[PDB]
Amino acid sequence: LELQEHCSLKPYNTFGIDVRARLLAHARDEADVREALALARERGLPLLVIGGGSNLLLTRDVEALVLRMASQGRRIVSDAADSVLVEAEAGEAWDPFVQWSLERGLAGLENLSLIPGTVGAAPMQNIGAYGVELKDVFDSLTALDRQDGTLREFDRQACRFGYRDSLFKQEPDRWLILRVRLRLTRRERLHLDYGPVRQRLEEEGIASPTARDVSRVICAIRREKLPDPAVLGNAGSFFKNPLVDATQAERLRQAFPDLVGYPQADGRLKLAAGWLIDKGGWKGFRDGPVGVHAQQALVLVNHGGATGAQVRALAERIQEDVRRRFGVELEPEPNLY
Numbered sequence: 251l252e253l254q255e256h257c258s259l260k261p262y263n264t265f266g267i268d269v270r271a272r273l274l275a276h277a278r279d280e281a282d283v284r285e286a287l288a289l290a291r292e293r294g295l296p297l298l299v300i301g302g303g304s305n306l307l308l309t310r311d312v313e314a315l316v317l318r319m320a321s322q323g324r325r326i327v328s329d330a331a332d333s334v335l336v337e338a339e340a341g342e343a344w345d346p347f348v349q350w351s352l353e354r355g356l357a358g359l360e361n362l363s364l365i366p367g368t369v370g371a372a373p374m375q376n377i378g379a380y381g382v383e384l385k386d387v388f389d390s391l392t393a394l395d396r397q398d399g400t401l402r403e404f405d406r407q408a409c410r411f412g413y414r415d416s417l418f419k420q421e422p423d424r425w426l427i428l429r430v431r432l433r434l435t436r437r438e439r440l441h442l443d444y445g446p447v448r449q450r451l452e453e454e455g456i457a458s459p460t461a462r463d464v465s466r467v468i469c470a471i472r473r474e475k476l477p478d479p480a481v482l483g484n485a486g487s488f489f490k491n492p493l494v495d496a497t498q499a500e501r502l503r504q505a506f507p508d509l510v511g512y513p514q515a516d517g518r519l520k521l522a523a524g525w526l527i528d529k530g531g532w533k534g535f536r537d538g539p540v541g542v543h544a545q546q547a548l549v550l551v552n553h554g555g556a557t558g559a560q561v562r563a564l565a566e567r568i569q570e571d572v573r574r575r576f577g578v579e580l581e582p583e584p585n586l587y
């Protein structure tokens with residue numbers, strides 16, 4: 251590998267937290283993952299796999315081997331007429347991957363445009379946006395099993411995809427994703443449904459609504475709402491949207507008339523966590539070098555040189571303050587290390 255000893259991780263996590271790793275390693279392919287894995291054992295260290303570090307909260311120096319996935323390769327596997335199965339290596343940067351697909355003439359990823367991170371990490375959290383989740387186009391992946399080292403294929407059912415969840419987040423540290431295969435489409439009628447994405451597409455003339463168009467749109471909305479971690483350290487939205495049983499829903503319902511909620515198919519209501527945190531007077535909060543954004547209340551930030559623990563403590567403060575005022579527990583989205 252390109253091994254580095256006791257070296258900072260500030261340029262490796264979108265929060266910008268400066269903690270040291272006992273060893274840093276960059277994996278270019280599967281041969282590099284194997285040896286990196288025999289090191290972590292042949293030096294008694296635990297192994298921490300990272301991609302772009304945009305779903306990751308670091309709180310202490312990492313007495314691990316940190317293995318940054320930098321595997322590279324973007325390929326069409328199959329071409330059926332209306333569906334195309336593509337495959338990309340784990341370290342491939344996600345958004346350029348999206349551009350690659352649109353370049354090739356394919357739809358399916360367009361609503362996941364400009365999401366940070368790697369292809370390898372995308373199945374971990376089942377990345378979702380603008381009504382689309384990775385499972386909608388997920389076909390299969392290849393993962394290294396860290397109990398015995400044997401590669402196996404995971405079809406879609408086997409991944410137990412959930413809202414910002416998967417078997418790989420349920421069974422953490424077991425599986426190391428190397429490859430991801432998605433089925434993309436051509437010339438499918440356009441997946442858009444009464445939102446700002448549409449409002450702003452149909453203003454452009456909408457001669458034809460190609461995925462490339464909607465992908466151009468979505469970037470623009472992203473570039474206007476979401477804080478860039480290149481200026482304000484963050485890991486995007488910090489809390490998942492909580493969903494409550496119909497009984498919890500009914501009591502909060504007639505306690506706040508606003509209650510931005512969303513009804514699911516199983517009967518229960520998924521509350522807008524942005525509302526909860528904003529109704530809790532948290533928007534624009536700042537204590538020391540951490541806070542929440544002044545617009546998107548879901549985005550916790552490091553204004554400058556914060557610690558992961560401070561971020562972690564603001565998170566916890568918010569969760570209690572919410573739970574102790576509405577009776578809902580906000581779960582986080584990033585993984586804490």
Ligand SMILES: Cc1cc2nc3c(=O)[nH]c(=O)nc-3n(C[C@H](O)[C@H](O)[C@H](O)COP(=O)(O)OP(=O)(O)OC[C@H]3O[C@@H](n4cnc5c(N)ncnc54)[C@H](O)[C@@H]3O)c2cc1C
Pocket residue numbers: 264298299300301302303304305306319340365366367368369370371372374375376377378379425426427428476477478479484485486487585
């Ligand atoms: C500005 C910003 C905007 C965002 N917007 C969105 C959004 O719209 N929608 C959304 O869903 N998310 C969003 N995110 C968060 C999203 O989860 C991450 O950006 C991205 O999905 C994580 O990819 P990564 O390679 O950076 O993973 P990392 O942060 O590097 O890793 C996260 C977790 O995955 C594990 N992991 C990483 N690579 C592998 C691998 N190869 N095999 C196994 N486990 C692995 C790590 O160990 C860790 O547990 C946003 C984040 C930021 C900073």
Ligand SMILES: Cc1c(C(=O)O)cnn1-c1ccccc1
Pocket residue numbers: 378379380381382476486487546548549
């Ligand atoms: C959660 C979310 C959705 C969604 O729930 O579909 C669409 N965009 N985002 C988002 C919000 C803040 C930061 C990053 C992403």
